[PDB]
Amino acid sequence: SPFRLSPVRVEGRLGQRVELQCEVLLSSAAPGCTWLFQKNEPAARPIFLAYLSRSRTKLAEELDPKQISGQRIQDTLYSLTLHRFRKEEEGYYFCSVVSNSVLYFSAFVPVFLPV
Amino acid sequence: SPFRLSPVRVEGRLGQRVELQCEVLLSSAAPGCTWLFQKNEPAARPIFLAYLSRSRTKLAEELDPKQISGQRIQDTLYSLTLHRFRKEEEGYYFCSVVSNSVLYFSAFVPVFLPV
C-alpha cells in the first residue's frame, strides 16, 4: 500500500466544496506528489491536474484556480480541493509518486453526484 | 504533440512479436521514459511496466522479461516489445515523461486481437 486516501469516496452535491487528501507511505519517494483524473469510461485518458512539492507548485494550464486548487500540507501529505463541485468534475481522482524509478498510482477516489 | 508513436495502433494475432516505439519531442524533459499499460475497462488503473534511461533499466517485478521487455534505442527513442502476444496483453499502451514538473502521457496505442 503506497498511499492512503482520506475520503475513499465522495458523494458530491452541486456547489459543495470537496477536499481530498493523499498520504504517501513509501519509505523514500522522489520529491513531490501528482494529482491525476480519469473520466468514468474505458480508454479514459489520465489527465494531469497539479504537481505539489515543498519548492514547486504547478497547476495545469487549462484549469481555473478558483474552481480547483492543491496544496502540499506536509512532507508526505498532499491535498486537492474542488471549490464548487460541478458535473464536469465527476470522475476518478488519484495521486502519483516515483520511487526508485517506479511510477506508483494510488487507488481511485470516486467523486460522483448522487444518481 | 509531446510524443511521436510509430505504430499508433496494433491489430495483432496471438503469438506475434509486437514492438512499440515512443519518441519524446519535448525540448526539456527529465531523464528517462516510462511505459504504462491500461486494461480495456472503466475505472481501469494504469500499470507500470518499465523505466528506461541511459543508465538504468527497470522492469516491473511481476513481468517475465522473456515475455515483455523494453529498450532505449537512442536519446528520445524508447521501445517496448511483447515477444508472444497473448490475450492478457490486450489493452492500451502509452509512455510518460515529466517536463516542467508536468506529467505527460502519449496517446493510447490500442493493442487488440480482431473481434
Side-chain angles (χ1 to χ4, degrees):
Chain A
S1 324
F3 307 80
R4 191 223 211 234
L5 282 326
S6 277
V8 312
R9 163 177 216 123
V10 174
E11 295 185 335
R13 294 144 30 243
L14 291 168
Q16 84 165 83
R17 160 195 199 273
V18 175
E19 200 203 298
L20 315 174
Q21 270 163 39
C22 155
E23 175 179 10
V24 183
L25 305 178
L26 278 165
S27 34
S28 57
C33 181
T34 291
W35 282 104
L36 300 165
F37 177 81
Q38 263 183 26
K39 184 120 161 131
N40 187 23
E41 60 188 7
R45 254 203 313 140
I47 288 147
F48 167 87
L49 300 183
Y51 176 73
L52 308 174
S53 78
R54 194 222 174 75
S55 71
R56 165 96 173 120
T57 280
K58 181 48 166 159
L59 190 81
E61 197 68 31
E62 73 264 25
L63 310 184
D64 174 19
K66 274 293 299 136
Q67 288 184 301
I68 177 171
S69 150
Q71 154 185 128
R72 185 243 197 211
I73 303 148
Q74 261 208 340
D75 160 66
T76 47
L77 194 43
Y78 310 84
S79 79
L80 181 72
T81 306
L82 314 171
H83 280 290
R84 302 286 157 122
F85 188 61
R86 50 204 274 118
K87 183 178 179 180
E88 99 198 325
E89 297 172 313
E90 277 193 293
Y92 299 101
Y93 295 75
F94 54 111
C95 52
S96 179
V97 152
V98 177
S99 176
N100 300 300
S101 286
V102 182
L103 247 187
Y104 292 91
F105 306 97
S106 70
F108 281 10
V109 173
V111 177
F112 293 91
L113 282 178
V115 62
Chain B
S1 37
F3 299 92
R4 185 191 193 256
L5 297 163
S6 156
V8 304
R9 74 195 15 228
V10 175
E11 174 192 323
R13 59 138 174 101
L14 294 171
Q16 142 185 69
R17 188 179 169 107
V18 184
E19 179 178 323
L20 302 180
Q21 270 178 58
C22 215
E23 201 199 325
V24 178
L25 303 170
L26 307 155
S27 284
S28 315
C33 179
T34 288
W35 279 105
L36 298 169
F37 177 71
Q38 203 171 277
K39 282 134 215 299
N40 192 23
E41 218 59 62
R45 291 177 76 250
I47 311 301
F48 166 93
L49 299 172
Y51 174 82
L52 298 165
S53 78
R54 229 171 301 197
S55 35
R56 191 62 267 126
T57 300
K58 174 61 153 107
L59 203 77
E61 63 96 1
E62 73 275 19
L63 293 178
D64 179 1
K66 210 236 197 200
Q67 302 191 308
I68 300 113
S69 65
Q71 207 195 235
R72 174 189 193 263
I73 294 133
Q74 49 176 302
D75 206 27
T76 83
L77 196 56
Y78 310 86
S79 157
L80 189 71
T81 302
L82 313 172
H83 294 281
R84 282 175 181 85
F85 187 44
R86 49 181 210 285
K87 194 130 190 91
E88 288 79 5
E89 291 168 331
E90 301 184 272
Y92 310 100
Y93 293 76
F94 51 112
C95 292
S96 197
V97 288
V98 173
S99 176
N100 288 272
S101 288
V102 184
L103 247 196
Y104 282 91
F105 308 97
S106 77
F108 281 4
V109 178
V111 179
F112 294 91
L113 304 157
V115 55

